[PDB]
Design brief:
Chains A, B: This is Mu-type opioid receptor. Chains A, B: A lipid is attached at residue 441 (S-palmitoyl cysteine). 2 copies of one chain form a homodimer. The longest helix of chain A is centred in the middle third of the chain and has 34 residues, at 161-194. Chain A has 2 domains: 1-200 and 361-442, Rhopdopsin 7-helix transmembrane proteins (Up-down Bundle); 201-360, Lysozyme (Orthogonal Bundle). Chain A is mainly α and 442 residues long. Chain A is built from 19 helices and 5 strands. The first copy, chain A, starts with a helix and ends with a helix. The interface between A and B is large, with 46 and 46 residues. The structure holds the ligand *[C@@H](CC(=O)OC)C(=O)N[C@@H]1CC[C@@]2(O)[C@H]3Cc4ccc(O)c5c4[C@@]2(CCN3CC2CC2)[C@H]1O5 (2 copies), cholesterol (2 copies), [(Z)-octadec-9-enyl] (2R)-2,3-bis(oxidanyl)propanoate (4 copies) and chloride ion (2 copies).
Chain lengths: 442, 442
């Protein structure tokens, strides 16, 4: 029974540090207002699940040693239910984390709208409901099975037993393993696919304008669609939809496609460059610029039009003579800046530096992405052997040796060990987290 | 038997366009010297497999219609063997493609060494050997099974039959589905993790120097290790290993760790900046520069040392006065340029532009990565339903309805349809490929 006792020891470490760590994490998330972010809401869900599983650990270890389940019927139902709930909610939360990461990175303008932590709370609730769809019947079908001279807290079914058992094994195998992993993989691939640094004007302006496929009132309150493409001053939707129909050639109903937006984009960019070329105030300043600053100029022409950018005589003067800090200061004193300060700040920085540093993303995204990725990898390493082992046993017979039981309980074990591994990871891969940890320690 | 006839029609389309397409692809790869790249070698392997499966298609359709296998014993063995070989070699090739992509992107300096197409050919061979480990016994255990009034080309086993059958199902399920998908996922995650554009000096210099963890003779023929960190002029390894031991503090034996290289890196970068600061010729030119050009200066000090970069009076003059094209031209006429032209070209471009455009990667990488990613996604969409369906049937009983057989043969069908889907994809996601296609068409 050395296996049983080593299981007890290992499980004691996992239980103590697991509970301690997850309680610490949840408490920290709840307590500080700085710690309340979408990522941290998801992390909270994860920590909750882990805390529950670890809570059920000590009852299992004494089951190992006694050879019986003393704790009754209801507590058993609770235990198994918590087991399944953990298995589901964990990987589902990892999924929502991968999706949220993908959104935060590949769709920043859209990200700022719905990446509020309340949405993370909502999707966490939905996670728990979907998981309730499997967890509740498991809680119902769990009971105490009496045997010759022992007691079991197994999940039992009516005849044919192997049927319902293996059916459950299928459902968990598809929904709690295959599908979520596939979703994560798609998120990652799509992420590599849609992530690329900004070195040109087209990328630059999309950061400034965004991809909105429906007609929306802009900052100035005018009906707009695509990437910053303006339609009409009038408030009526038809005069905007008919202009959209005119710009496209087919009846839009107020909705276009990505290719139609990209096509609408390129013509506006060239129309801006064209407009510059026919302007005797702009065209000279145009050729005096490096590509980065030339892009900044097109950005202004894109926004307010050629006639408006024409009346920037002194800023244009300073630009043509290459007086950068002078021009930047003068540009910051315009009504343009007063209207759209953040965008103007980026463009002015582009004029001043000749570098793209006003656009390139913060390192926070990279750090959090790294964190989530590593967490996911650890989870996969911990849960893959058991998910596979179960399916294997379900459909073939294994030559009973001590090695079989050792490997089996080892897989179950590490499957539980993930739960105590998690908070330790939060410390290393997150600076605010290790900061909170230090605040609790020092 | 409408199912059988529609299967025949569908399979005729898949067979004709599949064979045509894959033969076309393979021929194009073989014929042109421009088409011989690592990516295209992998693609060749894929096309080969697909061509084989499609080759086995027509024999199956007549099996559907006749209700018997007329084609004998050997041809049957061939068919099933080809089936399994396709299933394995395809996804293995996708794996090697994801790995090669990851290498090409995240380790360019290392990439240029072993991304020769001969290595792709070698790994293709190994792919076929690993796949031979499962394909050969399948070819042996395949035979003609006679029944009441029909004939089967099934794979049959001795008693217990379900045991060996389900065992095979397990092995294919782990090795031809789970594990490869996991490997791909790890490649993608690691890719996002190690991919980031260049905006600072540390990234810049790593591009120029590379991460080599063993002591190697550099371009100048001196013993070097880490990121461009020099050791000794002497040819003896000990005097280099002892210097490495001295630089680290523990006995290295000529091998360090990534953290030790990164630490060795930061001190050299600052030592360069320090050296500049104590130089009355360099320090003035230092403060006159924007961050990008300041990085270029550190790059030179890193390479040839403070004393060498001191004797660039005229280039330094032109730099301080901000005469960029002048300085760039003058720098290109140095013995520095004559020695290491490619690196010097990048640094000079950095001095001339103030932008990082000499470092940012080619769009070819992005395009090919996109291609491979999309191919992989399509494959997953095509092979997932059947891989799952098989496991399901292996361990539970399905209520026999027409819907069951329809869905089943539909899954098998699309599983075969991937093979004809592939070459069409090569046309869209690759410009050289659609160019070859046009050369064959127009
Ligand atoms: C059925 C056959 C059997 O031997 O039951 C004793 C079976 O293996 N059910 C598993 C046992 C392991 C399990 O309690 C674990 C691991 C896991 C993975 C997959 C899956 O289908 C099943 C399981 C569980 C339920 C979930 N817990 C999760 C904790 C990490 C260990 C049963 O269902
Ligand atoms: C065993 C039970 C059965 O009903 O045999 C008739 C079984 O399902 N074996 C599968 C049938 C399908 C199969 O011929 C296909 C698909 C596939 C996927 C998984 C896997 O384990 C097995 C298979 C094959 C062998 C591979 N081909 C690949 C072609 C794309 C269709 C058998 O083994
Ligand atoms: C790190 C991850 C990806 C690896 C996946 C682990 C899986 C594939 C490995 C790890 C441990 C392995 C099991 C260890 C013990 C046994 C008992 C033996 O009599 C039959 C094989 C069997 C059932 C193995 C099946 C495959 C197995 C479950
Ligand atoms: C696109 C990919 C990721 C989706 C995965 C497809 C899988 C999960 C789906 C697609 C078709 C589905 C099968 C369709 C037909 C049947 C017969 C039915 O009596 C039992 C369910 C069963 C066996 C389904 C099992 C699940 C199934 C195999
Ligand atoms: C913190 C709450 C106390 C948990 C103790 C479990 C104690 O659990 C144990 O000691 C078992 O050996 C673990 O399975
Ligand atoms: C059996 C388990 C069932 C789990 C069901 C889902 C619960 C988990 C969902 C979201 C986690 C909550 C994070 C903290 C915000 C709410 C508490 C702190 O409150 C706040 O600060 C808000 O502003 C107002 O509530
Ligand atoms: C090209 C080679 C000829 C292949 C014909 C298969 C012809 O195959 C067929 O016609 C069957 O219907 C497909 O299963
Ligand atoms: C039953 C299938 C067994 C498959 C075994 C592995 C074969 C596939 C491996 C590599 C693909 C070859 C690509 C073309 C290069 C060799 C032919 C063209 O030759 C060349 O041009 C070379 O320079 C010299 O050979
Ligand atoms: Cl960036
Ligand atoms: Cl780049």
């Amino acid at each position: 029974m050395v296996t049983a006792i080593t299981i007890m020891a290992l499980y004691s470490i996992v239980c103590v540090v697991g509970l301690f760590g997850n309680f610490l994490v949840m408490y920290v998330i709840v307590r500080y207002t700085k710690m309340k972010t979408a990522t941290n809401i998801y992390i909270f869900n994860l920590a909750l699940a882990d805390a529950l599983a670890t809570s059920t650990l000590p009852f299992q270890s004494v089951n190992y040693l006694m050879g019986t389940w003393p704790f009754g019927n209801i507590l058993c139902k609770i235990v198994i239910s918590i087991d399944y709930y953990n298995m589901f909610t964990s990987i589902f939360t990892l999924c929502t984390m991968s999706v949220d990461r993908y959104i935060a990175v590949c769709h920043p303008v859209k990200a700022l709208d719905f990446r509020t932590p309340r949405n993370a709370k909502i999707v966490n609730v939905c996670n728990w409901i979907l998981s309730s769809a499997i967890g509740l019947p498991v809680m119902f079908m769990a009971t105490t099975k009496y045997r010759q001279g022992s007691i079991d807290c197994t999940l039992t079914f009516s005849h044919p037993t192997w049927y319902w058992e293996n059916l459950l094994k299928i459902c968990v195998f598809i929904f709690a393993f295959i599908m979520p992993v596939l979703i994560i993989t798609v998120c990652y691939g799509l992420m590599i696919l849609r992530l690329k640094s900004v070195r040109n004007i087209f990328e630059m302006l999309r950061i400034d304008e965004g991809l909105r496929l429906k007609i929306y009132k802009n900052t100035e309150g005018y009906y707009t669609i695509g990437i910053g493409h303006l339609l009409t001053k009038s408030p009526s939707l038809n005069a905007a939809k008919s202009e959209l129909d005119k710009a496209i050639g087919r009846n839009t109903n107020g909705v276009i496609t990505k290719d139609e937006a990209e096509k609408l984009f390129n013509q506006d960019v060239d129309a801006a460059v064209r407009g510059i070329l026919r302007n005797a105030k702009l065209k000279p300043v145009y050729d005096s610029l490096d590509a980065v600053r030339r892009a900044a100029l097109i950005n202004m022409v894109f926004q307010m039009g050629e006639t408006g950018v024409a009346g920037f005589t002194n800023s244009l003067r300073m630009l043509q003579q290459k007086r950068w800090d002078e021009a930047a200061v003068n540009l910051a004193k315009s009504r343009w800046y007063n209207q759209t300060p953040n965008r103007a700040k980026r463009v002015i920085t582009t004029f001043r530096t000749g570098t793209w540093d006003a656009y390139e993303k913060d390192r926070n995204l990279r750090r959090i992405t790294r964190m989530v990725l590593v967490v996911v990898a650890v989870f996969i390493v911990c849960w893959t052997p058991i998910h596979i082992y179960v399916i294997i046993k379900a459909l073939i017979t294994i030559p009973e040796t001590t090695f079989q039981t050792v490997s089996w309980h080892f897989c179950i074990a590490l499957g539980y060990t993930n739960s105590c591994l998690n908070p330790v990871l939060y410390a290393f891969l997150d600076e605010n987290f290790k900061r909170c940890f230090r605040e609790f320690c020092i």
